[PDB]
Amino acid sequence: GADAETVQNTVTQVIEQNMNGIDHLMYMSSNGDSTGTATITLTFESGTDPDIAQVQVQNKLALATPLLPQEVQQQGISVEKASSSFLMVVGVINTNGTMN
Amino acid sequence: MPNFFIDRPIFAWVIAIIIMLAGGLSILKLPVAQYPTIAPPAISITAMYPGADAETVQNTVTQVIEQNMNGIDHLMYMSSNGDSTGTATITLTFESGTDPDIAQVQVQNKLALATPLLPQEVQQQGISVEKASSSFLMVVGVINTNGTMNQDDISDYVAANMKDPISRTSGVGDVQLFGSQYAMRIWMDPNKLNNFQLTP
Amino acid sequence: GADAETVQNTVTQVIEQNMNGIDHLMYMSSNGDSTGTATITLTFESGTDP
Amino acid sequence: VDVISALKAQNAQVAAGQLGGTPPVKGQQLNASIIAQTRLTNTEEFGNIL
Amino acid sequence: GMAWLFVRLPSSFLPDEDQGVFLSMAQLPAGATQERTQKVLDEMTNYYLTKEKDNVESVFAVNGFGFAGRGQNTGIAFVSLKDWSQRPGEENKVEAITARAMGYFSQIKDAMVFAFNLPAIVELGTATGFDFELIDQGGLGHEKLTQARNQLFGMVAQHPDVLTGVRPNGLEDTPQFKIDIDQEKAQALGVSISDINTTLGAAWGGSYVNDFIDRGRVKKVYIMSEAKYRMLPEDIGKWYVRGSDGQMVPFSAFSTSRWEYGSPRLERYNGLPSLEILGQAAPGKSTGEAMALMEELAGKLPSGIGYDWTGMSYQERLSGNQAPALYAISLIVVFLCLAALYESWSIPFSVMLVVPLGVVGALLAATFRGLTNDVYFQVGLLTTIGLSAKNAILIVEFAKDLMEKEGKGLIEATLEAVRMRLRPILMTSLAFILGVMPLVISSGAGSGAQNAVGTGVMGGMVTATILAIFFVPVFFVVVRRRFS
Amino acid sequence: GAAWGGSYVNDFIDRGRVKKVYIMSEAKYRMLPEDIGKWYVRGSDGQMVP
Amino acid sequence: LPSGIGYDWTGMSYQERLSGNQAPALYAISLIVVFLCLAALYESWSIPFS
Amino acid sequence: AMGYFSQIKDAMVFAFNLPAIVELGTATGFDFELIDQGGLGHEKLTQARN
Amino acid sequence: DTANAIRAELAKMEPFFPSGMKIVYPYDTTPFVKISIHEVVKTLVEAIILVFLVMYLFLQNFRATLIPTIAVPVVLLGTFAVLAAFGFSINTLTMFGMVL
Amino acid sequence: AVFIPMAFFGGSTGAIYRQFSITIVSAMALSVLVALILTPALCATMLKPI
């Protein structure tokens, strides 16, 4: 339910103020929209081990988590070392047309 | 072999020139430093017990954490300190040549094992596992030549505009601000509170 | 002081649903018993770094 | 429930700050941390809880 | 003589350098306030900028922050010197500058002020010298441990010829203000314990309530009492808490106060309570001598009080312990390579009998220049092993060939080899000697390391040339006669 | 918040799986600015105040 | 743009700025090394030019 | 598709093909972040963008 | 490298400073590193010059003395190539090794 | 000498060129190894006298 301003000022700034000390960090971008979702993306230099980068980012996020609103924590913060483009889309269709 | 190059001087010259060319190209790309990576890696574990004396910190958090930390691979020695402010810092120094990333991962695993035994108060604060150093590489100070801004204004400007980009610069392990960010300070007056029958 | 059904529905299902994104995972199994303990075991591939 | 409430309230930690803490008054000369630990250790202190 | 010199050569890890900067610290007595620390820091800055104005470029004093231990009674200052060009002579170097500073800083009478040079491995430690760790191995307790430390300083002060600037790396026991909350009286007055704790904490230590947006940036919100109500034990009574009846009741009604003395920063080393001690060797003494004296002194402490070295001292002890192995393994490897190459056991033995000739020269070079047995010297010793073996090869290999290919006699072949191979030996030897000559006579920024690298191996070359050019024929002739 | 943005109260078990429970205003009552006045909050005295 | 308004390049724009076009230097090195190899092959400094 | 969509559709419709390397976008494209260094605010930043 | 990156970042920050603000550098160990490297390289070239004179003293012929001097750049540059291959860096220790 | 230097391209594209460089260099090395030992053996046996 939070708008863009609330999302930023209560989640994104709080998290990104603790995103320091990580190694091989090229640049960091983050955005929060009206649907209530905050998305912080940290790009690393080529050749950086994704597992170690995720570990360090997770450590900083664990430091910054208790300052976040309870609702945000209950919804579940997720950290993913994934690409940007979709590898594949697996659509599901009901041929009978009975289901919705 | 020497006779072969005695009869063929241009071959020897070519070999030497190729070696020299490779050397120059390597010089162009080679990094420069005072010393190589000599110091043993260190991992720091920082936990806070708000409003706990030094004696309480040692007994409640540091002793528990140290007990579990024993047994990590390539551990050289440990050290600890519990401040009156409640902060507990466990520094683990590993044998030289150890990969610091794997060391940090193992330290995090052991800390996760030892966390439930800790007081709930220190669990709420969040424990930090970070690669540690001992000495400052550089100190960059900021002054206002006009003599217009006190230390608070300079420190707040630094904390708001310079600390983070430097903190995220490549190779910057840690940045300490010799000042303090601005904060909305509310300075209460017990006489007025009592007069209005209010409490903090 | 929780039964098997309580332990499952309140701990094990949640943890299993949020165990996504780990690498080289072969299978996971879990259980909950009358004592109140939920034990979730994740088994990884042979070459995985523990 | 009342027993739980009393037990939760009884033991805690107080961040009591310091005497002469920063920012200090001009001329201050003594800075001592304040310790107010109303903690219960043995059985009788727990039994004595109101 | 080589053995005698090697035994008597003092040891150290890495030479100190003049890096253009040095540190300083101030440790006011326990319970000191921020203002008293600031006065001491101002005195230090004034000294730096007036008595050393020609050498000191700028001073950056940081009150309330220390290298080990953070408190109102501590402070540090980063001192940056002028450019090396602007500071000529030995008097204008970090060693002499800090020596002059300590002379003034030892008369402060208000604090313990120290100025020290940076360690060679800046990542390893914060200061040059050693890192002693007094350890309570017998569970004696904190009070005994500080008593043991005080006795150790009493012993140390009796040897100012070796140890200098020996200081603790922690915070002494400080007075503490204890407030006894008589909960039953609070219940009688109808005041919640949570209210008491919240009021006291927010009043005297501040409370981080929540955040606020300042020019678009998330900043904290704190509440704390005004300063003048937060200074004296009397100020406890000024703070009122509301009872359930709605009547304000002072803190004096349900609480009492008392003074105690407890440590503000407790330390543990390898799971045992410990006190860290920092210090330096006196001028004209090496770190090894200081460490040996520290171990000897710690021996005389009461039982149950152990000790250990950490950081730079740990690495230095490790180097000292591993050296002999390195030497033995290097000698064995060289011997095996010689045996494989020349297909003999006599030839390698005769060659290896030359290594002492180079080693004694390396030791004499360090002894004359007053250098120590650093890691660089160890590297040099290995280089001298190589060089002496090289000269022995240049003679023996040519001598061996004549005995086989031309079938000459033992003495005749040796004389011919010594005559013909004299000039190449001198050429290579002088080439190496003048090669490391710039290191030896260097005096600049990195002169400390360059002298250590060059001095040891240079004299080794001169003796592996002068002595070996005469002794190698003896070794070759004697060994061949016995066919050993 | 619960009326106009939906609130996630707790979980429930659906055909063996743990699924969330949400409360929200019915669509027709949170569509226009005028729909604000339809919502009432109960005071201390027990009276509904718009 | 008015005071206080900075800028920066991200993504591909960022990646292009750091990457320098070393191709002419690399090709020059390749030509030189090929000439040297040819000189070694023919035992002549002139024949390679052909 | 772009010809059909852009001419008719009231909204901005973009049919496009992913590049060979997804990260490296259009060869001529660029990403230009306009950063508010001085803490001016969203309104002033938008004015600067305009 | 980190010192240079920090200085570049400070250079980027400087235009947005309010009037009168100034960045000072009251403490920095990088100048010592640069001067020490310069000193060791000066020592190296002095060593090369001194070695040339020693051989020329015995050989007493420029062309004859030039032959061993040619062996210096080839060996040194080969050493630099080897250092690059195995990931070593140009530090005072490698420079001391080359001087020896 | 023609194909090795393109391996040392800098930047993001450095790996792209390194793939071609390594592939072609390895292919040429194997080719000359085969022509040195494999093919001459085949020529002696397979080729009927002409």
Numbering used by the authors:
A (entry chain C): 51 to 150
B (entry chain B): 1 to 200
C (entry chain A): 51 to 100
D (entry chain A): 201 to 250
E (entry chain B): 550 to 1033
F (entry chain C): 750 to 799
G (entry chain C): 850 to 899
H (entry chain C): 650 to 699
The authors write:
The K. pneumoniae AcrB (KpAcrB) multidrug efflux pump belongs to the resistance-nodulation-cell division (RND) superfamily of efflux transporters.
Within the “binding” protomer of KpAcrB-Ery, we discovered a large extra density corresponding to the bound Ery macrolide. No extra densities were seen in the periplasmic clefts of the “access” and “extrusion” protomers, suggesting that only the “binding” protomer is occupied by Ery. There are six aromatic and hydrophobic residues, including F136, F178, Y327, F614, F616, and L667, involved in anchoring this drug.
